[PDB]
């Protein structure tokens, strides 16, 4: 975009300061963040003395 090879980058591009200094972003169309991913809590094997 800075070199003119594209007009608009409609992609999941994160609005950040470094990028913001050279291009301009629209208002966010999608807000996200860091998150935790775990395996679904499968049923436990019955313990001795259950």
């Amino acid at each position: 975009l800075v070199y003119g090879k594209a007009d608009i980058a409609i992609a999941p591009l994160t609005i950040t300061l470094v990028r913001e200094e050279v291009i301009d972003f629209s208002k966010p169309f999608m807000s996200l963040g860091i998150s935790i991913m775990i395996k679904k809590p499968q049923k436990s094997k019955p313990g001795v003395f259950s």
Binding site: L1, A6, D7, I8, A9, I10, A11, P12
Partner: peptide, 24 residues
Amino acid sequence: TVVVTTILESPYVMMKKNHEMLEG
């Protein structure tokens, strides 16, 4: 016309099954 740039990133931008048949 304009030059819209993106990346291959499911489900943001995904190729259809018939991408070899259709090119646009």
